[PDB]
RNA sequence: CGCAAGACGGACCAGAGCGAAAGCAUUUGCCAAGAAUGUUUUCAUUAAUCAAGAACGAAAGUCGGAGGUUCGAAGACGAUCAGAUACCGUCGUAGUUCCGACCAUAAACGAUGCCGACUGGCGAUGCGGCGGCGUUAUUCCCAUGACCCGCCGGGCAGCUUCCGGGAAACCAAAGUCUUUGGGUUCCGGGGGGAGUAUGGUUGCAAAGCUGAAACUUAAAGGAAUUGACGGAAGGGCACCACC
């Protein structure tokens, strides 16, 4: 801390290791994404930190996990981040 | 007026300890507050191993260590000369004394 | 102690006087 | 004072159990089962004023007062077991202890394996004493 | 109860202990087996290699 | 006994050697002598102690420098080996080659020549 | 008892020891010659001797004390049977040191035989190689299923064996040995033994059975 | 060598953990409870502190049963001493332990009400989560565990300094206070008489809660400084000290 440091335009590096209510505005660290299971093919969208077991409406038993964080796949392929 | 930051005994966070018996006084102390020490020496003592080690049925023999755990009281541990009392802030050092 | 054992006479002498005014009465 | 038929070069074995309390020291010694005694003698035995009985002389006038009398019958070598006070007591060895035992090495015996022996509790009685302790 | 005397050579002296400062403590061999030694404490002015004289080799007084 | 020279005889034989050092030789009949020629002390017991503790000084100031005493002889022995050492004529070069982190720590100050790299073994110290 | 010289009323004895163990002759004993009607045979029963492992094995670590008593006598020959083994006392007070976890289980259990033994068992949680840590601490549950694991093998261990079997694995200690190796993906646990045995009841003697150990 | 009984759970055991506080440590099982953490779940002011009233409350102590190993008030002796109704020693009743009812106190202490905001640095430590080069274990795996390097919450603490404060010892709160006002509850007014007298009330009892006045007095007290002393510690010294 310099006694100088500007408030209204932070580092967009250290924006994001606050914790989410302490940085200017909100903001979640979850997000949503696309698994896509070996096998049977569906692209079902998933929560990250789904607490929920998940299926993929077809063959499987099966496709997340819950945790006490973000969830954890079985074999799921793409899971890529939606960004919207 | 106060004497030591920790009142002596290092319980911070609880309510109650159990208690222990010192080893000479058999006072009655908190197992936190008592004055511990291990002590690791010889079943024979030092001028006597030549000799032990001399007369041994066996060729190579390393003789047993005794094992034992301290406690004092401050009184009993006061008056044997286990710990003295320090200058007023020299009473600050945490670190054992130099072997 | 003094504080204790000045607590202890009292309470004592308080017993006698009490079993004598209302043993009186 | 018959002992085993054979004495040229093995070592017949015994055990000593050298109990050093404060106040007063035994040295026993028995077969190798423990069962069956031999000679025993005691600190107390060899001095005559209370204050003694514990004392490093003692202890080294009862040693040899044992040696001898088991070289008389067939024991060459030796095992010892050594015992302080134990349950809820000193648990250290008294003064009579380190001289003792070499009080018998030096007088003929052999040593065999020694071991500390001492009865040790998880968490006994109410020790003798008072919450204030026995204060001097 | 019946032991001979020994004779020993002070090797080295150690500091004067006792209550007044008054005996002595010495280390010595045994003019025998030069290998043995042990810690006496002595009433002379001990100085240093003369021959002691014990009449029971086997104690060590260790103090006062 | 005793025998612990006072700080009066320790400060006349450090101002005498600092002034007249090259008569001070190594025996001590002829530096009671010199000492009676220079200086005047007043007496024959302070006069012996003086220069006998100049002979003391002089024994140790043929090792190494002595750190109370400023000798002409001995200064400029450590002015040359300040001047300069008998090690280089050479600086240490500048021709000297480093390792990662620090090739883009000059990246953004735009070095591009006489280096080297390897990427330390993989945790922090042990 | 101080009728003249009671020494020279005593007799000597040998003491063997099952053949599983290398030195085979433990010692000597001695005991009253038979009288009136205390036959000596009587006192030279229900013995307990002992013994360190190195004057049995020759060969391996001097902890480990086996015990043996004695069932019959055959002519001068005391003939001993397992009893039971423990661990020297410093070997242990020196094993349990501060900042580590001190595990502990124990079971009973059958051999073939009717011998129902009590083992005990003991671990210690590991220093890592590369650790920084002053502590070696382990959580609850880990150590709840390192005793789980100690209980289970070194049941299967001994359910399925004679006797004359699970001594043979206490020799070298095979057990500890392998429950070592069992809960390292749990917490490494760098020290274990079986710190002692008791045995609790045995069935009835059956001398063949005996002499089937000293042949 | 063996049997029985009652209490006690050592060493690991820490300036570690959990609980509203008192308090809580052998294994395994059952029963409900909880803080912290994660969340792009839900309701939408539901909150803070609290007279009256209410639950728990160490040890001792009372009442009725069961038990009674060790220790031990009272007590009986033996010593020590001028005396010893004490310190020390041997013995021993109530008690100490369990079940059911009472009792409501403690240096119950961080001698420091609770809730919320802001104001320096550093390392560690227990729980959860996230990121990361190696090492290690199992099936060669992935998953997971032990370690190593960081980050985020909230926790018990520690070091550090001219933030500032204080009568100072000292305190990152005991700070943001004559530049005085974030919210609210209990409570102090020189020293003694005195937590006494009396009235009420609760309790089988022991006692608790509430609680005066007459009268008497110039000080009682807190932190720090310099001496003198100590049957306190570390060095050193003298035949007006000793050996
Ligand atoms: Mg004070
Ligand atoms: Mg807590
Ligand atoms: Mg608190
Ligand atoms: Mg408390
Ligand atoms: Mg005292
Ligand atoms: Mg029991
Ligand atoms: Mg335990
Ligand atoms: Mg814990
Ligand atoms: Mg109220
Ligand atoms: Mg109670
Ligand atoms: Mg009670
Ligand atoms: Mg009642
Ligand atoms: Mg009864
Ligand atoms: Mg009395
Ligand atoms: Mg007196
Ligand atoms: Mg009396
Ligand atoms: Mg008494
Ligand atoms: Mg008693
Ligand atoms: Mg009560
Ligand atoms: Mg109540
Ligand atoms: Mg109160
Ligand atoms: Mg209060
Ligand atoms: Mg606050
Ligand atoms: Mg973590
Ligand atoms: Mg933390
Ligand atoms: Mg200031
Ligand atoms: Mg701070
Ligand atoms: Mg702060
Ligand atoms: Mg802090
Ligand atoms: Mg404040
Ligand atoms: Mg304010
Ligand atoms: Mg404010
Ligand atoms: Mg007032
Ligand atoms: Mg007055
Ligand atoms: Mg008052
Ligand atoms: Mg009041
Ligand atoms: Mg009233
Ligand atoms: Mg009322
Ligand atoms: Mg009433
Ligand atoms: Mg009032
Ligand atoms: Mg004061
Ligand atoms: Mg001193
Ligand atoms: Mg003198
Ligand atoms: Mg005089
Ligand atoms: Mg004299």
């Known amino acids: 801390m310099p006694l100088a440091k500007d408030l209204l335009h932070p580092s967009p590096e250290e924006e994001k290791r606050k914790h989410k209510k302490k940085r200017l505005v909100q903001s979640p660290n979850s997000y949503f994404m696309d698994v896509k299971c070996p096998g049977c093919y569906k692209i079902t969208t998933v929560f990250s930190h789904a607490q929920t077991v998940v299926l993929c409406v077809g063959c499987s038993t099966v496709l997340c996990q819950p945790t006490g964080g973000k969830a954890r796949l079985t074999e799921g392929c793409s899971f890529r981040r939606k960004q919207h | 007026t106060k004497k030591r930051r920790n009142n002596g005994r290092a319980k911070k966070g609880r309510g109650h300890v159990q208690p222990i018996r010192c080893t000479n006084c058999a006072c009655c102390v908190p197992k936190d507050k008592a004055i511990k020490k291990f002590v690791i020496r010889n079943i024979v003592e030092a001028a006597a191993v030549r000799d032990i080690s001399e007369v041994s049925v066996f060729d190579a023999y390393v003789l047993p260590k005794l094992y034992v755990k301290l406690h004092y009281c401050v009184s009993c541990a006061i008056h044997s000369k286990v710990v003295r009392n320090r200058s007023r802030e020299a009473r600050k050092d945490r670190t054992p004394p130099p072997r | 102690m003094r504080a204790k054992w000045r607590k202890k006479r009292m309470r004592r002498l308080k017993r006698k006087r009490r079993k004598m005014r209302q043993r009186s009465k | 004072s018959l002992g085993p038929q054979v004495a040229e070069g093995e070592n017949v074995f015994g055990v000593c159990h050298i109990f050093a309390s404060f106040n007063d020291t035994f040295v026993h010694v028995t077969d190798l089962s423990g069962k069956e005694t031999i000679c025993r003698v005691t600190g107390g035995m060899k001095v005559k004023a209370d204050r003694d009985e514990s004392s490093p002389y003692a202890a080294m006038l009862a040693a040899q007062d044992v040696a001898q009398r088991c070289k008389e019958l067939g024991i060459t070598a030796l095992h010892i077991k050594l015992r302080a006070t134990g349950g809820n007591r000193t648990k250290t060895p008294g003064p009579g202890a380190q001289s003792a035992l070499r009080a018998l090495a030096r007088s003929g015996m052999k040593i065999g394996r020694i071991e500390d022996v001492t009865p040790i509790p998880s968490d006994s009685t109410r020790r003798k004493g008072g919450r204030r302790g026995r204060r001097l | 109860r019946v032991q001979p005397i020994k004779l020993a050579r002070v090797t080295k002296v150690l500091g004067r202990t006792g209550s007044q400062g008054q005996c002595t403590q010495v280390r010595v061999e045994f003019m025998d087996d030069t290998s043995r030694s042990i810690i006496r404490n002595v009433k002379g002015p001990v100085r240093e290699g003369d021959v002691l004289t014990l009449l029971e080799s086997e104690r060590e007084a260790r103090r006062l | ?126 | 008892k101080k009728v003249v010289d009671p020494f020279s009323k005593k007799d000597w004895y040998d003491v063997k020891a099952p053949a599983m163990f290398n030195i085979r002759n433990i010692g000597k004993t001695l005991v009253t010659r038979t009288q009136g009607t205390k036959i000596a045979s009587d006192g030279l029963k229900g013995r307990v001797f002992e013994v360190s492992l190195a004057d049995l094995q020759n060969d391996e670590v001097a902890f480990r004390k086996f015990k043996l008593i004695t069932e019959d006598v055959q002519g001068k020959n005391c003939l001993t049977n397992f009893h039971g083994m423990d661990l020297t006392r410093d070997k242990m007070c020196s094993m349990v040191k501060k900042w580590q976890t001190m595990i502990e289980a124990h079971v009973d259990v059958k051999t073939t035989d009717g011998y129902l033994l009590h083992l005990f068992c003991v671990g210690f949680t590991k220093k890592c190689n590369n650790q920084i840590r002053k502590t070696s601490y382990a959580q609850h549950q880990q150590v709840r299923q390192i005793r789980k694991k100690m209980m289970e093998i070194m049941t299967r261990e001994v359910q399925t064996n004679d006797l004359k079997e699970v001594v043979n694995k206490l020799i070298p200690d095979s057990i500890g040995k392998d429950i070592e190796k069992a809960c390292q993906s749990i917490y490494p646990l760098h020290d274990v033994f079986v710190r002692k045995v008791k045995m609790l009841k045995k069935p009835k003697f059956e001398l063949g059975k005996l002499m089937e150990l000293h042949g």
């Open chain 6, 1 to 126: 006994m005793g025998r612990v020279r006072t700080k009066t005889v320790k400060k006349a034989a450090r101002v005498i050697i600092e002034k007249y050092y090259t008569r001070l030789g190594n025996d001590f009949h002829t530096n009671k002598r010199v000492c009676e020629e220079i200086a005047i002390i007043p007496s024959k017991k302070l006069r012996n102690k003086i220069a006998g503790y100049v002979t003391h000084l002089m024994k140790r100031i043929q090792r190494g420098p002595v750190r109370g005493i400023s000798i002409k002889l001995q200064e400029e022995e450590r002015e040359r080996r300040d001047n300069y050492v008998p090690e280089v004529s050479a600086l240490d070069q500048e021709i000297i080659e480093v390792d990662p982190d620090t090739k883009e720590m000059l990246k953004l100050l735009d070095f591009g020549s006489l280096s080297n790299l390897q990427v330390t073994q993989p945790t922090v110290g042990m």
